[model samples]
Target: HSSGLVPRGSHMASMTLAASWQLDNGLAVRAISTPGAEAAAALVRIEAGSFQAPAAWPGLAHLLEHMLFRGSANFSAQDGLMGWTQAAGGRLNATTQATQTAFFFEVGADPLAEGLARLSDMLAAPQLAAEAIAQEIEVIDAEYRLLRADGETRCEAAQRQMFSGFDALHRFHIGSRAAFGSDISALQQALRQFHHHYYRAPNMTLWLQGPQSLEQLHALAQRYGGGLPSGETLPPLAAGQDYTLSLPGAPQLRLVFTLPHCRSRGWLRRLERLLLDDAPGGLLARLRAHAWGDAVRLGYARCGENSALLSFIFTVNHGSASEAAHIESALLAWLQALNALTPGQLAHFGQLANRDFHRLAPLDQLRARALGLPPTEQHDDWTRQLAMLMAAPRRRLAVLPEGGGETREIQGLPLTLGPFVGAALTPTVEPFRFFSASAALPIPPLPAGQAPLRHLHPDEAQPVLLLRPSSHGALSEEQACGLQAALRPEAAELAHREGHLSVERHQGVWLLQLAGSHGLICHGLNVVNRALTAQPPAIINEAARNLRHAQLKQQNDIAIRRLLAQLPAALNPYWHATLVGGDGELKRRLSHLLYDFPYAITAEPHPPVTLTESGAEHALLQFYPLQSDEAEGRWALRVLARLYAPRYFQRLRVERNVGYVVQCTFHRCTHVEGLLFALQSPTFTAEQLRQLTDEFLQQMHHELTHVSVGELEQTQQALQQNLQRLSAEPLQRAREIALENRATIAAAAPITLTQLLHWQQRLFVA
Candidate 1:
């Protein structure tokens, strides 16, 4: 309503109004009004990163980035801006790149002003406490260990090598403890200076998005951001790189080329479509013929203001460091072939790419804000860049598993043939070849989520709920997987002339949605019937023994994964079965497709399981079973969990340095839900983690009483939205609907502040 936004003069994605203004301190501010957005977000991207760091102190810029979040001049570590946002059930995150560092949050739009004020000062006047500096550094080491050997790191290594006018790698972006040396006082001094100089208005881009009018947001941005310290953007942070690198994985030969950075984002999509084609005459086919590689991953990442690193990563079965020359020749050959394609072929690829562009959906406001600008429909402009790309300077990296036939390079970056090549794809019709007619009668939503629809017949042992939403037709990840399986593809296609056939598993139920003539629909159902009724498989006992060695269920946090997998066996045999569309004989024919526990299930008590083994960490899974089964009870626990989780995380992850994996969530594996705590730490044992949990649980209640109504209401609203933000797709909607039916939690009303505290004490007296 406040008409503070300037007139928009720039391009934007559909349904968005983009505008910009500058604060007196030199910070550039951009705001967009997404009229119907459910949440609001503010992002402050500082144009500084590791590249700008002092040579001796590799991660100085990154370390400074963390301490800013530790607490500001007005905010404390325990109840700082981070906790404030968390209390609102909002999402906040920060990223430190080679040339940029960003901090942003997506919160309740109504409270956007308060959050923006907090965000501004956090960057404007950070405390950078001496006490937390060491701990923060330790936390970063954990991140490095977990994220080591990643492609970004590998690419950065290439960048460093090429830019240094040599070859090799180092993830200086997030350096280890040893890299900073054992002088905290000196480190602190350098970090403060880095923040003081670079975290200024001139080097910052303040971006905000919400349902608020552009004027309202712009005014807020100016009011809060105007005082941020302004200074000239630093030099080295604007520096550049391209080099080859490797890590532990399947061997890959990646050609890293440096291209001039441009705003023409569509070039990425067009290049991916036209050049990475898998047709018979394409680059991939040519590579396969020579046994150099099978797949070419086409992608790019920014290096600096003027440079971008684009790559073609070829998946190689076996490779030598000496084979670079032949690859480059093939790449050049492909470029020539692609350039020879008719405009119609190029236009065909562009259309495919444009479809992909529209298909991309930003799931949240923060994501929408992060998508800075729309891709251009400049097909001619995209093609023009082909010549520029061909002239770009390049490097090579061969990433192979350590001991598997790798010709280890004594000198970094494999000497490559500087490879790259592509062609028109053959016309392949979709599986759905028929669409002769349309239906007049529309299908209603299934009645599964309505009033307490309970079981199968009293005599029937199987638990099932059948609803006839469609009077005409017919519903596992497995059965859907079976349909997509080429097990009987030829026979399956013969069953019906399908249209808009969607064979998917919406939760445990199989959803077979076929749109076509009645005969085709029945035939589609018939095809699904065959796949579900199809036989299952197993290898010999030797195979079972071999597969059993996969003790790690989920990496980094196996204890919780193991416990969740084992918990189901201990719970009572309870289930919610929902089938949409199908009745009478047709229903009978499809009923068997829904798999249920037959021959009666046996149950047992669950005692805490012992977990010990490492490559990752020691894991802990501790929980408190809620006595009540109502939605309010679950939500009450959610509020309590939400209230104390940040504190819990602060202690375990940030303070205690409890190993990386740490979180608590309201979990449901059976008929009832419970407040579950999961943590994985390499340093501390399981007993220690449990004790830490006990310590936090003991202090949680008294601490929660300090919560303000705004905080509580925000958390409450978050849960309410959780209940209401149903997915758009029918299958996903059905899953949410079933959950909604099961608990009816989404229909829950907001509780009073007193009621919240009362519920916390009543449910959690621990």
Candidate 2:
């Protein structure tokens, strides 16, 4: 779109009109014209990532992404790029990968110009302030703290270490408090140099999509995006030499391969589909024929120049080289089967991908063009590439829970020993289900109008069951969650035999759902009743595990929820089970059921806590209760949440890089729905978070007083858009339905935009 000295040819498949251009400053730009999208998105991809980071400063590139958002030279902290976009009914997020980093935002089409200007300047003129270094570093380190406990993080690091040449690829790039030593000045300078060297315009590609004409988009691109400075494109990072390192954990077999860079993902997806197929006569089916592995997970990612990582993690027993080499032979034998794939079989997978493609949101479809694989094509290169990829240099590593399978670094050479074990193969007959109990029973019909209770059914979908305990049976949130988690495993197994079962305790309610026939549902209810009174170790063990999870979960939990949890439980409470199609069935069964839990939901009130970790997240939240559950009052609070969120995120997360978690939402923790303002940070104490929140609320009050109609309308439009889209999950639908009451959905006053904005003034109480 920009007036550029060069043009990069663009490809188009369907409705998206695409074109590419290079700016005078060397930045690449792609423009897409979508017909009717009210929402628009902009993405800028820079090739620099952990690969280009200083080896000593492993997180330099990542830290640069964080600092880039902290403050740019052209836009100060208060007038932050992200904040300005959020204020215009927009969303922004950036991700730094092993080899690249991207900054992108989606905004209302009307705000694309402003959105582009700010986005460009943020990258082109980022002011990595010296003073802000420590706070953002803690922010980065805090990010590492959250993922440190993940089993894969450490195992992945061990695997990376087996690679030679550049050690950054091997280093733990997600910085830690120890890794990021206390010298703020050095960290600040390193970030700046990293930004200057690798974040050059030539290394970046900007993609903009909107309803506007390509000519107009180009003009906007040239005017605002042209400020980026020019520089030569740096060579991409290397994946380095590969070796097989024995890492310990899970008794599973892993076969890894380093292949040539995959030019097209079509063949790969086809191969994945073929490998994933377990119906019959597929790679997985053949593997299961030997009881070697029931399922296989394919892992693939592009590495550096001429290198890409592809691996298969199998659900199989891990032991000696004999066990390893046998599985390897079976996998290699799959190549012949793939070469034998007929055009219809190939076209079938292609159609499947196309069907999956149409299921994404419209804007997402346009966005997918930037990263998603092109349509599957049966070209000469496709089969040839597939063959080459299968024959690529391979390594075998058995990651085991015990010592027998664990070993030191062994070269990635193919195994020479071990012979094939052809165990007896037997085919099983499928038993015919003679008669269906659900079919014999009269199908439950939906109530013509809103009925108090009815028998509803789940037609091949997810499930929902909202449990609100009666006042007499009221239990604390922890007790309810423990109960549900205890029942989950058994419930899961039983549900698997017939259909899917979903169970969870959230927002002070227990939802037990099953999407299946009525006969199994009846049996499921009986099992639940037995499990409730039973003191079996399984129940106790699961409850304890649930407790630990809650505690670990609380470590990162936000103020709104954590504070709500701190409040005292209610004595006189409410009981609710919101019924829809699924809910209807449960209601009819409740009458005949013997072991129903009489749940009491106490709308609770606050408590104290401390974390032991160095970078433990502390949260602070303020609640403004809704006076009544009336339609107008609820609508006002909903609008207040919508209007307040942008400014809140802007001021808290933008003005100061105090914390990475900033949330302002309409939440229900106790009996009443309130607007909750919460901020969690590793650097700030709870009291400090509270103090800054108070300061923010005061400033927000002023802005709220002077708030304009367009801002109100924009917020209003966003809320309407949210309401129009129904949750795909039945469980989610049930949660929202739990919040509903009779006749509350009726219309209020004609227009309350100004009235709602004013209504929020009284909400900022301590």
| lDDT by candidate, in order shown | 0.57, 0.59
Q: By summed lDDT, which 10 consecutive residues of candidate 1 come out lowest?
A: 468-477
lDDT of 2: 0.59
List where candidate 1 sits over 4 angstroms from the true fold. Answer: 1-14, 147-171, 232-253, 269-299, 313-380, 390-396, 402-616, 622-629, 667-673, 701-714, 725-731, 740-743, 748-766
Q: What TM-score goes with each of the models?
A: 0.69, 0.65
Please, what are the lDDT tens digits per residue for candidate 1 over residues 322-436? 4445555667655545565566555655665565454443223333233332343545664367777777776666554452233332212232212121122232221211112
Residue-wise C-alpha lDDT for candidate 2, range 302-387, written one tens digit per residue: 55655666778775543444555666677776665566556765666555555445445534554454444444565636568767
* Model 1 clash tally, residue pairs: 17
Per-prediction CA RMSD (Å)? 9.9, 10.5
Predict model 1's lDDT versus the native. Answer: 0.57
* Deviation from truth (RMSD, Å), model 1: 9.9
Candidate 2 stretches greater than 4 Å from native:
1-14, 22-26, 176-189, 213-224, 232-254, 271-298, 313-337, 361-380, 396-628, 654-658, 666-679, 683-703, 706-710, 717-766
